[PDB]
Amino acid sequence: MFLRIDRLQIELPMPKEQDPNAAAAVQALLGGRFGEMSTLMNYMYQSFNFRGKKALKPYYDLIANIATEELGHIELVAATINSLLAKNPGKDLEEGVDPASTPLGFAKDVRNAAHFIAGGANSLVMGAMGEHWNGEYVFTSGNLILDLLHNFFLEVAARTHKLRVYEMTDNPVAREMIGYLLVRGGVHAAAYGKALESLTGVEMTKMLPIPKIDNSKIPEAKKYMDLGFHRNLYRFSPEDYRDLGLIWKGASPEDGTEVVVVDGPPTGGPVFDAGHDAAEFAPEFHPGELYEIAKKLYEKAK
Amino acid sequence: MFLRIDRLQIELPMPKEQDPNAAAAVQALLGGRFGEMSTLMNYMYQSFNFRGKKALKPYYDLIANIATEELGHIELVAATINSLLAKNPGKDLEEGVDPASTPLGFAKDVRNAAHFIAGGANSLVMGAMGEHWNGEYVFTSGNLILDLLHNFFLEVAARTHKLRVYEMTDNPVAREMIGYLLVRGGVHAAAYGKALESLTGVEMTKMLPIPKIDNSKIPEAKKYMDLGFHRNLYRFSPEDYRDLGLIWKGASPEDGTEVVVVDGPPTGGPVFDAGHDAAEFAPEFHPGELYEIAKKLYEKAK
Amino acid sequence: MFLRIDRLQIELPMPKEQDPNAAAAVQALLGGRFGEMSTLMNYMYQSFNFRGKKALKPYYDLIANIATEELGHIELVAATINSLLAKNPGKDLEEGVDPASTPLGFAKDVRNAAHFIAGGANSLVMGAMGEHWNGEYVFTSGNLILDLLHNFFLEVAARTHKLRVYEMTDNPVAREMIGYLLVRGGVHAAAYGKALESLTGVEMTKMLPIPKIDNSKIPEAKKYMDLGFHRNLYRFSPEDYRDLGLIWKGASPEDGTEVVVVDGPPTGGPVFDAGHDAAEFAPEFHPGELYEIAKKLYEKAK
Amino acid sequence: MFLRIDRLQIELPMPKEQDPNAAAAVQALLGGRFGEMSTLMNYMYQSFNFRGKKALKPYYDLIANIATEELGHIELVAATINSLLAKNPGKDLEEGVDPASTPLGFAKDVRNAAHFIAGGANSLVMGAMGEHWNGEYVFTSGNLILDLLHNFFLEVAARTHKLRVYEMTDNPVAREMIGYLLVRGGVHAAAYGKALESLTGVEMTKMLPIPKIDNSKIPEAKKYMDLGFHRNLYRFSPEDYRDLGLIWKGASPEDGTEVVVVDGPPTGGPVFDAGHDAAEFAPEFHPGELYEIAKKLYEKAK
Amino acid sequence: MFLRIDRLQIELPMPKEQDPNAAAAVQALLGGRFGEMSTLMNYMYQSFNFRGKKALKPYYDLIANIATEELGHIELVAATINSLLAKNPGKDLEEGVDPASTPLGFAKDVRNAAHFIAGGANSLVMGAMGEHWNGEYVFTSGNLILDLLHNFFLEVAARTHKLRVYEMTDNPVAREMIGYLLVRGGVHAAAYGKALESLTGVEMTKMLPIPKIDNSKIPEAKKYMDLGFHRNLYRFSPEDYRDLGLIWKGASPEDGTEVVVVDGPPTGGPVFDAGHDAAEFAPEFHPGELYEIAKKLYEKAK
Amino acid sequence: MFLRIDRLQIELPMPKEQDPNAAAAVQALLGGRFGEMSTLMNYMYQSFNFRGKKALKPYYDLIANIATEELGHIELVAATINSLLAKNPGKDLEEGVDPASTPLGFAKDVRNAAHFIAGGANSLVMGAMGEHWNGEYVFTSGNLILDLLHNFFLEVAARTHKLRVYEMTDNPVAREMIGYLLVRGGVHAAAYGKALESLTGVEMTKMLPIPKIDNSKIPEAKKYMDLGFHRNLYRFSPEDYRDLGLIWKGASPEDGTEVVVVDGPPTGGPVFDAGHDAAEFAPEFHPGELYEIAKKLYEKAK
């Protein structure tokens, strides 16, 4: 079972203005083959399908727990996309938008028109070419070593996509999200590498980094490492998965320092609200009446 | 962000036999168009994309919270499929399997060979025809009423699929899961119906049930209604989404009785472990050495 | 624009038994790559996209008119599938079905479970492997000769699929439909062949038949040829497309006799009603109340 | 069976010049998930699959007839796309185009290059991201109420897409088509809402409009309402489907006025011919010889 | 550029019976995600896309050459499927087949009806669920180490699928092919492992075997190891790719013995001819006349 | 089996600078429905699946041999795309690229962002809309005439796509590749036309050219015809497929001159190396160390 906390894993800054094509690129990191939907769903299904949940508990704890962290990663990437697509972030009501004036004319020419037609200028479950995420992006073989090898690869392929998208987008919201997730994915690759070392004797962490560029070269990632985030494997559970430190121990590939298991989630930051976009009819063409209905619900609870 | 509890939402019975084609049918309820992946991802993305998270808070709480419940539903359906595919449920080691003896011969003739080739006799992210789940199964328009109308329909379509699959197999593991999720889906349809009533004045819950058959006629669903579980909307959050009762109030469609919000998840049941299946090399061809490695990780003194 | 006549293009026989796997095979002829959805949508879009609708009018008339015939062919193939899936053909009410008795148990083991889960034991927009029909099955290049060459090939590929499916099932409903559509497809291939001859001088009809087997060797096709139906190109329009005989003239490939345009559709046969299937909740679990509602709508006096 | 009339459901104006990206956006309304292919194919297959064609005749008439209207809607949207893609609308011959001069250079940079590579600058069976229409966009459950609920949703989701595309495209051809189809889809949603009211007692039409914006705010739609088109359900059949007025009666959601069944199709407008585009080789590189062949066909018919 | 030799990479045994469902399983090894189409197209595109073809030549030679071997592997797997589907292997003519006798009746009930409808009882470009091979099964990142890590994983995933299919069928044609390709895939995994060791210092070959079962335990693989074939990396080029031994050197993972480059292909075996299948119209319904045409082409004197 | 020669079928010129959208258009010719992957895989699978390999040998030789030529065509088109995507063609090391400077900013706005995210600025297995190539683009019926008719169509449809892309792209690398492949595809269509003439008596080559434009109007193609390349069917085999001249004889459709079989491949031109692109991490972020590793491999081979 799962619980939800209404916080992003990190706070995000506010864009100056909408950037459709940046959003379209960041979609690769959400619904593309090596996006956060893929790391999420790989580890989630592997955790369901895991054989030897007690006999191989340290490894089950690892996969089950990282799966849970990836839920917050799809959330964070979606928030980044939504921030880039928001007309009026935080503004509950805009008046005077006239559909006859072609208020979405810009969207005719952007890469991803689906963001504005199918979405209400919001994230979709797709990659940078509009390709919808698919379940064949999941590998769940039941063989622990084969799955872990897959997962080590998956994390460094995902890293490579994050680096490339970072190099496309100058928006601070994207750069902050990517810098943070470069550090988190670095932890995951290190953890799966340590798991493989324990099971096979092959020194997988010595292959890192892939590509051969340090996260320290990405300023936003460097800041998060200066805060210690590359050391941290958070236990995203009230009471379970207490044996993470049997694998998540020893040296960090980033700097050689001792890694640590942190009890509980980080404190994070606020969730994002894109506000009213009347031309998208989102959350309504003119939401004033619906806001009054919601206000009255609180009154009649008395 | 999210947390995980290492428990299924309910206790499931022990499978007494492998039933591949029953598993293949139950896959519709996991990765088909109207399976639990679809209710999950619809509500998850709508929750990310929600505009007016404070101004329309009761409705945000509702979608965000139901999304979180659906995480446990994909888990429960996957455990059911894994139960139907398990050769040696709960058993850490089977010896003496020889690939040359054709130990997967039965799998040649089953509907879903992928369960045995791609999976290690485990669940996959697909429906009853082998179709992998896809992101175009998600509707996230940004318009609150349009989304809620979609979701009401989605829940009753999903219910229809559950009823049809129930009629295909008398397997007790599958029927236990379906009975429970008929009740839970009944709550979700009722909740979206109540949300629509509040926003539009249209008495959507008076359309229920769809199809025109009562859950009380399904013995395994009646079991859970007899415990009161159709009344309960569980708040799957430590501290957030506290305004569910502004919508989740008034009469149950099942029996006219007053519905209630329950703070926190139900107690749950243990997770499922399919055990060793040597022919699937899962978790290893012979996992004895890996089990010894895992045991030695605990020798870590202190 | 289009009009509809509530009749199948031919009378079909009453199914005597459900035959799921025969239905699954016949789906190739509906939603597979070379099924009736493909001939329909190819000619429909080519007709929309046609350049020179006046300057090349005989060829426009041909494609526009054959497209219209193919609407009745998807209808006929769907009726055939529905006949093979019908539990109680023509019967408005069956009572006493109990879901707990596993009334869909047989469907667990059939090839196409989607017919029973997604469909209410009815046709779906897919082929013999469950693959949903897709728009990339359409070729609409704007170049008349290239399109016509495509269409000649399409018809003989479709014929090949019909012959193979015919050889898979001796079901009389399926064979009646296939015999008729072998004849109709023979007309379409001949017509596109004659169109190519007129534009290029290449004697395309001399390539027929493909494969090298005569329709006269298929008893159910010979039935319709014995009535003269291989001669007939029906003009499915009240007033338009009057120049078909500029192309549809000269010898039939079947027997060398003169072909003719028939103004208007053939008489047809009744539509098919699969009746009540309570286990599929179709048209309702118990439709008695809905039938009473419908009856009362007629009480509307005047 | 079906018949064809060589008229669009409304006349369309002529664009000043080609607008590739407008065409690419309008594709959502043709081959996207909530485009006219989807309303067409949903109602078409539901009509084939309908159980109780006599006992539930008013509802069968409704679905069967609306399906027929949607055939003219795919035609109208395709004509709109073709109008936006036409280089030389109405012009049968352009001379002097040299492929070596890069006459399609502009198409290198447009959103939808397939329009110019796979199509001969013509419509394709796809949406606004190039995604080909697929049969999984059809819902045909066999359960009348479930299907009608689906269809009510489908029409208002389609409306939402039409409004968004309208807000992207200032081209009169697009605005006229969309204004007209907003009114027609308004009729369909009202009709399915009235059908649900009759079967369930739930006042579905009171939910309209969705989104909460009146068609009267869209100038082209307002004109069509001033002509009475929101009242009209046309009977697209010579002799069938005569019981539409048992459901299609009472108040219009637009203005409260009495709705009416119109015997027969509207008179409509001319079909569209994009003319010659030599760089697309459409209908031929230089069609002069083919036009002479067609002329001679009329001579030799004497 | 490429050349072709009209020989399979090994001699295969004569099939003694048709086995449709065995063919359907073996399709996973052809067009599934981890089939030979995937190893082929991965290495082929990586070879095209390779940066540093001179500066990193040993690694280019390796990928370019293994790609070429995989061409013969798709050929070998297709021949195996065709053997399992052949009615009359090696026989040019069967007379007396009558379509009306339902000669394809068995095919109604097999898993893969497409083999008999779309194919003429022959291989298709698809996996074990009928899923057509797709280009998203290719990973071509341009980063040498990332690609090589991918390829190491790909080979051991492919091996896992081969082992599972081997366990599904005791058909001798299938098992001969699988035994040989277990050996060949073992060479490829070892070679990519050695390439990774050279570039990273990580002892990837020490992870082998994955799964933890030796090829020597599969009798048909041991057959080929007993001939020495696990030592051999064949250079499939007349004059190019001469630096393979810079990487393909040192110990075999199978037995610790020294591996070698073999200049040129192995001798091979004859190609397979499934013979006439009249019910499939393959190569014609009755090919006697075509055989006479072919014979007469040789009468060409000189 | 197959062999590889490290030469392109023709030399290609060097672009002045990267042209992403030209690359995206040329992708249609690689992985689109009528691209070189399709001609390749059609003929390859038809050759595997061919019945009567001896009795119909001239036709088997033709398909098997043309399949082999198409391998070099996917190679040539990929080289063209890679040339258009290369930042630094031929340059082994660029220093000073800083990811923090947004060095991929241009790629945010191009049509095909996947080239820069999933690819390392390299070719992908997809068409001009990002659609990945799929195995349903292959037709392998087992019926010789039906397949040959398909293949004649396939070649002229492919030609049409090549002409359209030529008209979009002024880059010499694209124009040279397309001019050459127009001539080669002209040979293939002529050859399949001659095969059909021999088997059927229908004068298929008289339909050529399709579209009705001569290759002589494309300057690059004209040059290759002036060199005689339209006459040449190269035998891409050491010793096999020696009966091509039984079909490949008589008049060329281009100019009436006698066609010829050439023993062996053409001499071709150099393969292409895109060089270092540090922002793509291709072949490494900074490949200096890897180049030193490769150098040392040659030293330690002594």
Ligand SMILES: [Li+]
């Ligand atoms: Li911006």
Ligand SMILES: [Li+]
């Ligand atoms: Li640090």
Ligand SMILES: [Li+]
């Ligand atoms: Li625990």
Ligand SMILES: [Li+]
């Ligand atoms: Li519970």
Ligand SMILES: [Li+]
């Ligand atoms: Li239990």
Ligand SMILES: [Li+]
């Ligand atoms: Li008839």
Ligand SMILES: [Li+]
């Ligand atoms: Li009948």
Ligand SMILES: [Li+]
């Ligand atoms: Li314009």
Ligand SMILES: [Li+]
């Ligand atoms: Li009005």
Ligand SMILES: [Li+]
């Ligand atoms: Li009637």
Ligand SMILES: [Li+]
């Ligand atoms: Li060999």
Ligand SMILES: [Li+]
């Ligand atoms: Li043999």
Ligand SMILES: [Li+]
């Ligand atoms: Li350029």
Ligand SMILES: [Li+]
């Ligand atoms: Li010449």
Ligand SMILES: [Li+]
């Ligand atoms: Li030979």
Ligand SMILES: [Mn+2]
């Ligand atoms: Mn992540």
